[PDB]
Amino acid sequence: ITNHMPTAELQALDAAHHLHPFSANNALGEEGTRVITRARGVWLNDSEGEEILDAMAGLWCVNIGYGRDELAEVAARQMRELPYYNTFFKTTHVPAIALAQKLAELAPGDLNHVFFAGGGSEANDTNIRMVRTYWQNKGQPEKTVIISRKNAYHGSTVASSALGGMAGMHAQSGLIPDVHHINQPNWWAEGGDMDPEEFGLARARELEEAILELGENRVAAFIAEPVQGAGGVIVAPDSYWPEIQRICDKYDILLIADEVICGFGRTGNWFGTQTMGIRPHIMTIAKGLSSGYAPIGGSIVCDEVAHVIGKDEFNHGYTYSGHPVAAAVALENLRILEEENILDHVRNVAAPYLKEKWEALTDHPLVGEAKIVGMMASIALTPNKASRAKFASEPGTIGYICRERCFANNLIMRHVGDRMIISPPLVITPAEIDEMFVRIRKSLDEAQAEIEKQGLMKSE
Amino acid sequence: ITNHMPTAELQALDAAHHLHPFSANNALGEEGTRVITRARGVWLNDSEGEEILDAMAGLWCVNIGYGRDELAEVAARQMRELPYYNTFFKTTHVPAIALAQKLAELAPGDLNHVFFAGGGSEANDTNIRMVRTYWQNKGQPEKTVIISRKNAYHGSTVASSALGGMAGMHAQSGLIPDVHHINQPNWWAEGGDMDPEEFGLARARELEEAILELGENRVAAFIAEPVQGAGGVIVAPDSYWPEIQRICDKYDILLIADEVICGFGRTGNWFGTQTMGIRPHIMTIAKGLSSGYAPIGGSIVCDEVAHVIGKDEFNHGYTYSGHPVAAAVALENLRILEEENILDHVRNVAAPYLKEKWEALTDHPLVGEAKIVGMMASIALTPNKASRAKFASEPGTIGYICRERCFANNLIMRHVGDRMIISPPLVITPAEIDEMFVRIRKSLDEAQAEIEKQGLMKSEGHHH
Ligand SMILES: [Cl-]
Ligand SMILES: [Cl-]
Numbered sequence: 001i002t003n004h005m006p007t008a009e010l011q012a013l014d015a016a017h018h019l020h021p022f023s024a025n026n027a028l029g030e031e032g033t034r035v036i037t038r039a040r041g042v043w044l045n046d047s048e049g050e051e052i053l054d055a056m057a058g059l060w061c062v063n064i065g066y067g068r069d070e071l072a073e074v075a076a077r078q079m080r081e082l083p084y085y086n087t088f089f090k091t092t093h094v095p096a097i098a099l100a101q102k103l104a105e106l107a108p109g110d111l112n113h114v115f116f117a118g119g120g121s122e123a124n125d126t127n128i129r130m131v132r133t134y135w136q137n138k139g140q141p142e143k144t145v146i147i148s149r150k151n152a153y154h155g156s157t158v159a160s161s162a163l164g165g166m167a168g169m170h171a172q173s174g175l176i177p178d179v180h181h182i183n184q185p186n187w188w189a190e191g192g193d194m195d196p197e198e199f200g201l202a203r204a205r206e207l208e209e210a211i212l213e214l215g216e217n218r219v220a221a222f223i224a225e226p227v228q229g230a231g232g233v234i235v236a237p238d239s240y241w242p243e244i245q246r247i248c249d250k251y252d253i254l255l256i257a258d259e260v261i262c263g264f265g266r267t268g269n270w271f272g273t274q275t276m277g278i279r280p281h282i283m284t285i286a287k288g289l290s291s292g293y294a295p296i297g298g299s300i301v302c303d304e305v306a307h308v309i310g311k312d313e314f315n316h317g318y319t320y321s322g323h324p325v326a327a328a329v330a331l332e333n334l335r336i337l338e339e340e341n342i343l344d345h346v347r348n349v350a351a352p353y354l355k356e357k358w359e360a361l362t363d364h365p366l367v368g369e370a371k372i373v374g375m376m377a378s379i380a381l382t383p384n385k386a387s388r389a390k391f392a393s394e395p396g397t398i399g400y401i402c403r404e405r406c407f408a409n410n411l412i413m414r415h416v417g418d419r420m421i422i423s424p425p426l427v428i429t430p431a432e433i434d435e436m437f438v439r440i441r442k443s444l445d446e447a448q449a450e451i452e453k454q455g456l457m458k459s460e
Numbered sequence: 461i462t463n464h465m466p467t468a469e470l471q472a473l474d475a476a477h478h479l480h481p482f483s484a485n486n487a488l489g490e491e492g493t494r495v496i497t498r499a500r501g502v503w504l505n506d507s508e509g510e511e512i513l514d515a516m517a518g519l520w521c522v523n524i525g526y527g528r529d530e531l532a533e534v535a536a537r538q539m540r541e542l543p544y545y546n547t548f549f550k551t552t553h554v555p556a557i558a559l560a561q562k563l564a565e566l567a568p569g570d571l572n573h574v575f576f577a578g579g580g581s582e583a584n585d586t587n588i589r590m591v592r593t594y595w596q597n598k599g600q601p602e603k604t605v606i607i608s609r610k611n612a613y614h615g616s617t618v619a620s621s622a623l624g625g626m627a628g629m630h631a632q633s634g635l636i637p638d639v640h641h642i643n644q645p646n647w648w649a650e651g652g653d654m655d656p657e658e659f660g661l662a663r664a665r666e667l668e669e670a671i672l673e674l675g676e677n678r679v680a681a682f683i684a685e686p687v688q689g690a691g692g693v694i695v696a697p698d699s700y701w702p703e704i705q706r707i708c709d710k711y712d713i714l715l716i717a718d719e720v721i722c723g724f725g726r727t728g729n730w731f732g733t734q735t736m737g738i739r740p741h742i743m744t745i746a747k748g749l750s751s752g753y754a755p756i757g758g759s760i761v762c763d764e765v766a767h768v769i770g771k772d773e774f775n776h777g778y779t780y781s782g783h784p785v786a787a788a789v790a791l792e793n794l795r796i797l798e799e800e801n802i803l804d805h806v807r808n809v810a811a812p813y814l815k816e817k818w819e820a821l822t823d824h825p826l827v828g829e830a831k832i833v834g835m836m837a838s839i840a841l842t843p844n845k846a847s848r849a850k851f852a853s854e855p856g857t858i859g860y861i862c863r864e865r866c867f868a869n870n871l872i873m874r875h876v877g878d879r880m881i882i883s884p885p886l887v888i889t890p891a892e893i894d895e896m897f898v899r900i901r902k903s904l905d906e907a908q909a910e911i912e913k914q915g916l917m918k919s920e921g922h923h924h
Contacts, residue, residue, distance in 0.1 A: 093496050125581075
């Protein structure tokens with residue numbers, strides 16, 4: 001079993017033993033998976049030798065791009081010295097110390113302390129436990145309710161599924177008590193005839209209304225992604241975040257900013273919370289933290305919350321919390337992002353160039369809107385732009401059609417319902433972006449022809 | 461910031477920024493954490509130059525021991541070639557395929573399918589969601605309750621905490637609805653006047669009682685570690701597991717064997733499941749999977765459960781599910797365990813030697829019982845073995861004193877209540893085992909003296 005085995009045999013072995021995330025696995029197995037074998041820069045190769053443009057950066061995470069062999073070098077060296085030790089036994093190691101200090105340095109405000117975990121789901125479980133423990137330690141054991149949003153995504157543990165706003169996840173043991181969901185600020189889909197800025201305000205004010213309905217004395221936290229990622233890159237109207245922040249200042253609740261996707265340069269700053277000018281008590285991190293080179297996530301925590309949690313035993317943590325190889329890899333990732341000025345590249349070169357071409361996609365007959373913040377973008381596909389119509393088919397039928405075209409054209413672009421999404425490596429160049437657009441326009445053209453032929457150009 | 465920066469300075473930076481698991485972090489920060497800088501074989505070094513015998517194998521996980529540079533080479537090679545790709549987009553990579561195939565091969569019976577996760581806690585979240593979805597898919601959405609046990613440990617997410625049986629965890633948003641806990645088969649502490657085999661039967665029959673109290677139609681699954689690890693290495697009487705298995709056959713519920721600790725040679729087999737002769741529908745894996753050299757976990761799932769789950773979208777999984785570097789490292793770990801015959805080393809050499817010396821610990825005045833399965837072991841500390849007495853002090857008071865003596869004597873042996881536990885690397889030699897026991901006996905003698913100094917050598921009911 002090597003990259004030398006014929007593709008059909010690899011697929012057969014995968015189908016026989018490997019259960020894939022977010023899949024209908026029996027059908028997946030008979031259809032056969034695409035086998036990815038190497039990557040460099042923004043490009044992948046599969047087992048057949050296709051050259052594929054990865055406009056999704058792995059899974060919103062390979063921020064410095066592929067082929068950064070400095071990280072392999074750092075990983076091997078750490079693995080030889082100390083490949084594992086725990087942080088449970090009044091013990092630590094130097095990679096955990098250095099990474100936590102670097103994260104404290106990069107995080108805004110007084111976000112100065114780090115609880116490590118394996119990834120974003122595990123870190124949001126830390127957050128749930130930590131905010132509720134925080135309020136107990138403050139003498140307010142009644143404050144337990146966590147407010148989140150419809151169409152949010154916060155991970156895939158039972159409790160993290162519960163925070164997210166995905167009905168299909170809730171229905172598969174994705175619920176826990178004392179989570180409440182307000183509306184998402186998706187103007188395109190839900191704004192009606194409201195002005196986008198008035199819509200932003202009304203959607204934000206739902207937080208205050210929820211707090212008063214539940215009782216401030218019962219509310220522990222509000223959690224939100226700065227830009228909704230897995231929900232389809234939903235960019236809130238500009239009025240939304242300042243109104244949320246005002247509400248959070250007024251009431252005695254913790255603000256958690258989920259930075260799992262937005263983190264580490266994705267929105268054109270170190271954190272989406274800097275882009276949106278918000279002041280969270282906790283930030284959830286993973287993905288770009290290590291550019292996906294090693295599994296690691298965590299919670300960056302303000303002074304007050306860390307002090308209060310520190311006053312007694314906090315009966316929480318994971319074997320791999322602070323893993324020294326993963327921590328060394330993450331530190332090397334951050335060193336590249338910082339020392340090679342990747343954020344300047346994003347802000348001055350890649351983000352402006354992408355924006356101009358991305359937003360120009362509304363000239364395509366299928367494209368009703370084109371939204372982008374920094375290096376995450378979406379387009380809404382519609383059969384009638386005049387009424388911002390949804391398709392009459394199940395959401396995702398059209399998105400799936402376009403997605404299959406992108407993959408057949410050697411482009412990784414994902415769908416979320418009938419929105420198409422990108423999230424390229426931060427290091428992508430104007431030249432690479434041009435080629436991305438050649439493949440996007442070809443896929444959109446071919447998708448539209450398929451949609452028209454199959455009689456699917458129908459409004460709901 | 462390097463292994464060369466002085467200890468006090470490293471400690472100050474750790475206190476400034478690093479929140480630790482399962483700790484009182486403010487007090488920890490003022491004490492100063494211990495900084496581990498390197499590890500070779502079964503030995504750690506700290507930043508003061510102390511050499512420490514790691515009788516806990518990191519955290520029940522460094523099964524091939526430290527210093528196996530083959531995994532570093534395999535890791536670096538994978539990272540240069542393909543450091544990450546997702547398994548979400550109808551895509552896969554060779555490390556995931558090779559590892560899933562290898563796990564299927566080592567797993568018993570028809571446990572042939574693997575769902576990857578980041579570690580044990582995430583993998584038990586997979587299991588909760590999978591067993592519940594399974595019953596929904598069969599048109600029985602009432603089957604939601606998972607039965608587990610007091611003093612179980614199944615991870616530290618909200619829901620896998622709920623499955624664990626630790627009150628301190630549950631109190632800190634660590635409990636969810638539809639989890640029911642039956643009693644644990646700790647004969648030493650809880651057996652009363654019962655014979656151990658009668659106690660084992662009665663402890664197992666609580667599963668049947670709970671199923672009938674809840675209604676079989678409401679029960680999705682029972683989950684258990686073959687040997688309770690974090691709970692104090694609690695080895696059930698011989699009668700216990702055959703009776704749990706009979707009950708799990710009798711009633712229509714799924715059986716989850718949590719193999720997070722017991723897996724990968726720890727009980728002297730590939731799985732605690734083999735050792736105890738049980739037939740689970742799902743096994744949880746992590747820790748020993750990669751000997752802790754890379755974060756990775758998962759769930760190994762029997763044919764029929766996998767098939768039913770596979771019939772529709774299973775809306776679950778993690779960014780780092782199947783991580784190709786972690787998966788390459790895990791495969792190389794399994795290669796070493798298998799091709800250097802480490803399980804033979806355990807079965808023929810280390811386990812019988814360890815058992816001999818461990819069980820002889822009961823000649824020590826503090827040591828009431830000494831229990832051991834393969835390479836996981838515990839002792840119960842007592843002021844009076846003849847009545848299996850508990851100390852007058854709250855459990856853990858005496859265990860703490862002992863643990864502090866172990867730590868000062870450069871031995872990683874931990875306490876749970878007034879039980880001391882070890883879980884050394886599988887590859888420990890009889891000679892290293894001897895040196896471990898020199899440190900164990902010294903620590904027990906100093907513990908006994910410290911207990912006497914504090915006025916704590918009294919049994920329960922006898923404070924006055
Ligand atoms: Cl939309
Ligand atoms: Cl006990």
